[PDB]
Design a protein around this ligand. Structure first.
Ligand SMILES: Nc1nc(=O)c2nc(CNc3ccc(C(=O)N[C@@H](CCC(=O)O)C(=O)O)cc3)cnc2[nH]1
Length: 155
């Protein structure tokens, strides 16, 4: 199939942009979301969950993660690309979908899950973790939404 040539390239994209990030073994800030949104826009949730799940393995395998591989961050990258799917897939680019999608991702994946992982990886209690990370998760969503627009428009 043609679209599977595509899937690879966008995994490749997702992996590459993912390497533009600043941060800690606790919160990181980067362009990885850009790729993961593409996966949900173009391929839908299932293939988007697959591609996200996948692109994390690859990115891990090549670049490696601070503090080592954790199978949790994998799940996150899969849900991340799958939620942008349920929202944005085969639909007219709208602002309310962009807000809803980035808001759900940020709550479940970033605020919920990645904190759960970080809390686990470090010795912390969850809210200790949450307190270190919550400023980012309040600020970035608007940047994510704007970027998500230009991405969705551009393609
Ligand atoms: N398999 C695997 N994949 C990974 O990416 C990974 N990353 C780490 C490094 N730990 C972290 C901790 C927090 C964030 C983080 O806070 N990311 C943002 C999303 C990225 C963004 O929004 O720019 C977040 O808010 O959770 C990333 C990596 C450790 N093990 C891993 N293991």
């Amino acid at each position: 199939l043609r679209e599977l040539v595509l899937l690879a390239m966008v995994i490749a994209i997702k992996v590459v942009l993912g390497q533009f990030k600043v941060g800690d073994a606790t919160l990181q800030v980067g362009l990885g979301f850009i790729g993961s949104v593409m996966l949900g826009y173009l391929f839908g949730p299932w293939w988007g969950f697959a591609g996200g799940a996948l692109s994390d393995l690859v990115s891990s395998a090549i670049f490696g993660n601070l503090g080592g591989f954790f199978i949790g961050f994998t799940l996150t990258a899969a849900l991340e690309s799958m939620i942008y799917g349920f929202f944005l897939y085969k639909k007219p680019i709208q602002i309310w979908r962009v807000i809803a999608s980035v808001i759900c991702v940020t709550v479940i994946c970033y605020i919920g899950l990645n904190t759960l992982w970080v809390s686990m990886l470090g010795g912390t209690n969850f809210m200790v973790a949450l307190s270190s990370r919550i400023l980012k998760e309040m600020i970035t969503p608007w940047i994510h939404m704007v970027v998500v627009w230009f991405i969705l428009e551009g393609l």
